[PDB]
Design a protein around this ligand. Structure first.
Ligand SMILES: [Mg+2]
Lengths: 48, 205, 44, 107, 97
């Protein structure tokens, strides 16, 4: 009843977020996954 | 009120198909009560090919659209009538199209009767003068020889052309069988109306 | 380990990175800047 | 069974080039910018590898010589346009002449 | 052959390929990513800035509308066509005009 040896360390990292069990599979509407730009060229996507 | 609209526009459709009627036209009241009691209103049309086309305006929730035995009986006994029977048309309610058993009897009698073509249409095809609708451009069926000339000039096999289902409302009003060609005069914001030729494929179930 | 099939999909996969795009030689990149004395079809 | 080859008619039947008669062609008689550009590029590469030309005015780059050959109608190439792949193994082309045909802007 | 190892060659045969530097007047492709528009890649005539202290790509301001660019720190890839075929195509087909 006090088995700190076999303890789910996955829960030691506390679930500090509300919707963790729920899974989202759709494309995140903030990523460059389907856009094609390289680094230091992402500066062209700056404001204006 | 789809019954009255259907009643007027089916006869307008028969006129549009350039067919003559074999009988006298009953009024709205007799049509609707006969539909309600019998379950169907049967309309006979004769074409210039001297073929006979029969239309069956089924009731919304009658005895005939629910059980396949009676529907089978109607097809079997009506198709053995000695008319030429170029084409048979069934006009049924919209939710009936999803009901499987009616589609099964339709396809079974289609396979059993090869030369006869059977199509089941929803109500909304014949609740308006389809060729007179503003949003529908002018469809017309080009003959086989002129379609072949167009293809040979274009070096196109018939399967290359854009396809149009034989169940398209303008094609249904025109009477387009699958495998035939329909010429369309579509309004254009760019070229001020243009002509396309579409291939008629097999209809929906 | 990434198997054979894992190499294909996604942006960094074989297709969307090596096939639909490519890295090239003899190409240069730099910051652009204005030059009012260049023709519109000229680059400094 | 079989290693996808024994029944594999992978070898496609050889095609015969059918050239549409000069009075039957129905494609444009003016070079599209793509076709003119391709003609100039092919001619200029071929001058780079060979060097021969029919020009009177001598230029210092094959690009200029090929461009003038297209403009002055002495480029020795024929744009052939293919419109079919018949199941009968019969490729239908119509061979056009860049010397007779019109030339787009390109400038 | 490298050019610094050819102190005794002094001869270029007909059919030899020489890789010369890009001089003013050469055509070059000029691209800003993302390449959304058809005009995001175009060909500009090279103007070589022989000032060694300048390292930026310089363009006319009115040419920014092709690439939707501004000079707030944007970077644009530039490559010079070296083959004859690509040079012909670039000057005849992809020119910004
Ligand atoms: Mg910027």
């Amino acid at each position: 009843g006090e088995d700190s040896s076999m303890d789910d360390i996955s829960a030691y990292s506390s679930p500090g977020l509300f919707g963790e069990d729920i899974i989202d599979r759709l494309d995140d509407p903030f990523s460059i996954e389907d856009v094609d730009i390289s680094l230091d060229v992402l500066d062209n996507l700056a404001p204006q | 009120m789809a019954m009255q609209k259907l009643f007027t526009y089916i006869y307008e459709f028969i006129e549009y198909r350039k067919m003559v009627l074999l009988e006298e036209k009953v009024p709205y009241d007799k049509f609707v009560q006969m539909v309600l009691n019998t379950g169907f209103f049967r309309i006979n049309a004769e074409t210039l090919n001297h073929g006979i086309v029969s239309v069956f305006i089924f009731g919304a929730n009658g005895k005939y659209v629910h059980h396949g035995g009676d529907m089978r009986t109607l097809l079997t006994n009506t198709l053995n009538e000695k008319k030429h029977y170029e084409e048979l048309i069934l006009i049924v309610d919209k939710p009936v199209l999803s009901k499987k058993n009616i589609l099964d009897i339709i396809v079974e009698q289609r396979a059993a009767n090869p030369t006869i073509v059977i199509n089941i249409y929803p109500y909304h095809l014949f609740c308006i003068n389809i060729p007179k609708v503003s949003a529908i451009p002018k469809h017309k069926l080009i003959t086989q020889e002129e379609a072949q000339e167009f293809l040979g000039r274009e070096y196109l096999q018939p399967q290359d052309l854009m396809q149009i289902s034989a169940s398209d409302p303008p094609v249904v009003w025109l009477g387009g069988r699958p495998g035939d060609f329909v010429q369309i005069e579509r309004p254009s914001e760019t070229a001020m109306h243009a002509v396309v030729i579409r291939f008629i494929t097999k209809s929906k179930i | 380990a990434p198997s054979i099939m894992r190499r294909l999909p996604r942006k960094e996969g074989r297709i969307r990175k090596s096939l639909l795009g490519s890295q090239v030689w003899s190409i240069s990149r730099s910051t652009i800047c204005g030059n009012s004395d260049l023709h519109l079809d000229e680059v400094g | 069974e079989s290693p996808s080859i024994c029944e594999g008619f992978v070898q496609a039947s050889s095609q015969t080039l059918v050239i549409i008669p000069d009075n039957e062609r129905i494609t444009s008689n003016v070079l599209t910018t793509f076709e003119a550009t391709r003609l100039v590029a092919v001619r200029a590469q071929q001058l780079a590898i060979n060097g021969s030309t029919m020009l009177k005015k001598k230029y210092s780059s094959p690009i200029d010589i090929a461009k003038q050959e297209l403009f002055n109608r002495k480029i020795p190439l024929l744009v052939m346009r293919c419109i079919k792949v018949t199941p009968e193994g019969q490729k239908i082309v119509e061979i056009w002449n860049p010397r007779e045909m019109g030339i787009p802007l390109l400038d | 052959h490298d050019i610094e190892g050819l102190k005794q060659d002094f001869r270029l045969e007909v059919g030899d390929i020489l890789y010369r530097d890009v001089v003013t007047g050469d055509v070059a492709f000029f691209n800003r990513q993302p390449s959304l528009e058809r005009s995001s890649i175009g060909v500009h005539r090279i103007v070589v800035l022989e000032n060694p202290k300048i390292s930026t790509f310089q363009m006319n301001v009115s040419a920014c509308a092709w690439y939707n660019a501004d000079f707030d720190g944007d970077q644009m890839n530039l490559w010079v066509p070296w083959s004859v075929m690509s040079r012909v195509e670039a000057e005849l087909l992809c020119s910004v005009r």
